[PDB]
RNA sequence: AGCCAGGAUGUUGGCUUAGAAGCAGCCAUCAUUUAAAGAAAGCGUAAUAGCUCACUGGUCGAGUCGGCCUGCGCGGAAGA
């Protein structure tokens, strides 16, 4: 398959590991362009009918590990 | 363990507990534990109840105790005849009439308070009920 | 808009009132304004269900006595000490 | 659970799509993963096909509005409806290749011309 | 079989049933959970 | 109420750990396809797998759910 949403968000925010306390500790930032590229690879792997849908599932995977969208 | 810091008098008359309560209403928090029965709360009992409901809320919200053990109770010790003066003061009580609000609580959801007051009620000698604050 | 039906009281005092409450009605009184204070009785359960809502205390109600309507506010309510019941109610003419 | 108004809105929607669609194929949806269903919704958004799984009691209220009153008897068993709004057919070709490839469910009975078309004869459509 | 004056449901599996003037608790899962009022 | 079926994607969410994959713990608990499916209510594995629930479609076809105030009962209740 395509590499996990978590791995692509880890190499997008420039980090190694995500946050130990997600949404409390913010461990990095990713622009909406990175969200859309990552959710295009994940689009090749997703269930979404739209770009916004898959970019939203990658938004969720971005909030669950503590990485902000900037 | 609650007890009057000082008093005008050391010993007291037994008395009688009659009538209804004053302060049948919740004047502080949202919820309260009101006593439907009749009788005495020793200081110890108030302590234990308070502890139970403090454990149950995990030291969140706020708790009031609207009763206080201001009346001293005496006991002759073992192997003592009658007379030769009034016995010594062992402990203190609060006199409770039907309708009195013993504890009050807020800063917590309803359910948790119900649970807590149940737990505390378990430690008290008199029948109790759960009540809520009303407008007017 | 709450509506309360009531009959005037043919008797008064302690006895009248305890019999009243054991019959599942309860006394009340309407005063204020130019007129004379009007002593009434109410059906317990109706009022007991109505006063459960905040509006009851903040709002103008209508009491139907002998077909005649009177607008009132709830002023002061006496509750039974340990039970979920009402002893008695003051309504001031609005 | 659903409010009565939610169900009124949904009956109005299935009736509104029922008034604009040429051919309607009713098919059992059972025993299928939601990835095969994401693929049938993609192949269904491809052909102009409108796919839904609704309550059958609701489906007889959206059907009662003409000329679908024949399909009331195909609403016994779980019902997945395909409305082709633009072009007729093409749901009838996809549902059979889906039922054959998957080897799941049923594909019970269709409707066209104001008529019911039985499970075997939808090969017409 | 715990014999006590207070009998309760310790889970969803537990079922309270009265046999012959006695309140009992029967659990399909945990025979440890079996109680009798008395 | 029973019975039939689904209970899906990202994903093995991040942190931790030899492993932690809903199911030791800590944090978040978003979003997608949906009729519906908790970053999972319990069992289960070395970790998975696997059993099952929340939830929904079907069948069935008419009453059902839980509080309020009470009346009378049951247990609690063993001695020469
Ligand atoms: Mg006296
Ligand atoms: Mg008298
Ligand atoms: Mg026997
Ligand atoms: Mg059912
Ligand atoms: Zn059990």
């Amino acid at each position: 398959k395509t590499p996990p949403a978590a791995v692509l968000l880890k190499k997008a925010a420039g980090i190694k590991s995500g946050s130990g306390k997600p949404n409390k500790d913010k461990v990095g930032k990713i622009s909406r362009a990175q969200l859309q590229e990552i959710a295009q690879t994940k689009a090749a792997d997703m269930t979404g009918a739209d770009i916004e849908a898959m970019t939203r599932s990658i938004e969720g995977t971005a909030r669950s590990m503590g990485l902000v969208v900037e | 363990m609650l007890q009057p810091k000082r008093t005008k008098f050391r010993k007291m008359h037994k008395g009688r507990n009659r009538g209804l309560a004053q302060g049948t209403d919740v004047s502080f928090g949202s919820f309260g534990l009101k006593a439907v029965g009749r009788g005495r709360l020793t200081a110890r009992q108030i302590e234990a109840a308070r502890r139970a409901m403090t454990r149950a809320v995990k030291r969140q919200g706020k708790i009031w105790i609207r009763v206080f053990p201001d009346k001293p109770i005496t006991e002759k010790p073992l192997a003592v005849r009658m007379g030769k003066g009034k016995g010594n003061v062992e402990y203190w009580v609060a006199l409770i009439q039907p309708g009195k609000v013993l504890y009050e609580m807020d800063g917590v959801p309803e359910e948790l308070a119900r649970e807590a007051f149940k737990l505390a009620a378990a430690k008290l000698p008199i029948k109790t009920t759960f009540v809520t604050k009303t407008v007017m | 808009m709450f509506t309360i039906n009531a009959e005037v009281r043919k008797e008064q005092g302690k006895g009248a009132s305890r019999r009243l409450r054991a019959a599942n009605k309860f006394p009340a009184i309407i005063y204020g304004g130019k007129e004379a204070p009007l002593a009434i009785e109410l059906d317990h359960d109706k009022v007991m269900n109505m006063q459960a809502k905040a509006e009851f205390y903040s709002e103008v109600l209508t009491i139907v006595v002998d077909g005649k309507e009177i607008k009132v506010k709830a002023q002061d309510v006496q509750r039974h000490p340990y039970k979920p019941k009402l002893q008695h109610i003051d309504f001031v003419r609005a | 659970a659903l409010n009565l108004q939610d169900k009124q809105a949904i009956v109005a929607e299935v009736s509104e799509v029922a008034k604009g669609a040429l051919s309607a194929v009713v098919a059992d949806s059972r025993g299928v993963t939601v990835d095969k269903m994401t693929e049938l919704r993609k192949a269904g958004r491809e052909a102009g096909v409108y796919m839904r799984v609704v309550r059958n009691t609701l489906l007889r209220r959206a059907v009662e509005g003409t000329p679908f009153e024949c399909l009331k008897d195909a609403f016994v068993g779980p019902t997945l409806i395909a409305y082709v709004t633009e072009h007729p057919g093409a749901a009838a070709r996809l549902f059979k290749e889906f039922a054959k490839a998957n080897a799941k469910f049923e594909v019970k009975a269709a409707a066209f011309e104001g008529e019911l078309i039985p499970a075997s004869q939808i090969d017409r459509l | 079989m715990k014999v006590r004056a207070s009998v309760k449901k310790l889970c969803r599996n537990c079922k309270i049933v009265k046999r012959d003037g006695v309140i009992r608790v029967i659990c399909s899962a945990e025979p440890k959970h079996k109680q009798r009022q008395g």
Side-chain angles (χ1 to χ4, degrees), chain B residues 20-21 24-25 34-36 98-99 129 134-136, chain C residues 51 53-54 57 74-77 79-83:
Chain B
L20 300 165
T24 55
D25 318 310
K34 150 188 297 171
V36 187
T129 199
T134 49
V135 277
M136 182 173 303
Chain C
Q51 60 76 63
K53 334 173 179 189
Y57 295 104
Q75 177 72 2
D76 202 340
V77 42
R79 330 188 160 272
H80 186 263
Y82 49 103
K83 280 176 189 174

Side-chain angles (χ1 to χ4, degrees), chain D residues 30-31 34-35 38 41 45 52-53 55-56 60 75 77-78:
Chain D
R30 194 195 269 190
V34 208
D35 284 333
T38 309
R41 293 304 156 87
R45 287 187 303 266
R52 270 268 278 272
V53 194
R55 292 179 198 172
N56 296 5
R60 290 133 193 162
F75 290 150

Side-chain angles (χ1 to χ4, degrees), chain A residues 1 6-8 16 19-23 28 30-32 36 39-41 44 47 51-52 54 63-64 67-70:
Chain A
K1 312 193 70 169
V7 170
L8 306 178
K16 300 176 182 181
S19 198
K21 281 190 176 169
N23 279 110
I30 56 175
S31 61
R32 301 155 202 78
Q36 285 146 15
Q40 271 146 18
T41 304
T47 46
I51 309 186
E52 299 91 35
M54 302 145 154
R63 302 157 178 178
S64 84
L67 287 171
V68 301
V69 283
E70 298 292 329

Side-chain angles (χ1 to χ4, degrees), chain E:
Chain E
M1 180 88 78
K2 336 173 68 172
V3 171
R4 52 184 177 183
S6 177
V7 273
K8 291 173 154 64
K9 300 171 69 288
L10 296 210
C11 50
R12 40 156 301 105
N13 273 92
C14 292
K15 286 200 48 186
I16 286 180
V17 43
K18 171 165 183 167
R19 295 174 173 160
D20 208 27
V22 185
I23 292 298
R24 306 185 178 275
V25 197
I26 325 296
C27 204
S28 61
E30 192 78 31
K32 251 190 178 189
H33 272 165
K34 199 157 55 182
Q35 314 173 11
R36 140 154 150 268
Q37 197 181 50

Side-chain angles (χ1 to χ4, degrees), chain C residues 6-71:
Chain C
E7 297 123 340
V8 299
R9 307 182 64 185
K10 308 181 186 180
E11 334 162 7
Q12 285 170 13
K14 172 128 65 181
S17 299
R18 290 190 180 200
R19 276 185 298 267
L20 243 194
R21 293 191 197 90
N24 202 261
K25 335 208 62 182
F26 72 97
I29 177 84
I30 308 177
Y31 52 82
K34 177 184 56 185
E35 296 83 334
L38 177 69
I40 56 183
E41 70 195 67
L42 302 175
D43 172 83
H44 182 253
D45 305 354
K46 293 293 174 305
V47 187
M48 182 62 192
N49 290 351
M50 293 160 45
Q51 60 76 63
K53 334 173 179 189
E55 299 81 7
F56 181 81
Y57 295 104
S58 50
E59 286 186 8
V60 165
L61 332 174
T62 55
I63 306 189
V64 182
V65 199
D66 310 341
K68 185 193 299 179
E69 290 186 6
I70 299 189
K71 305 179 182 181

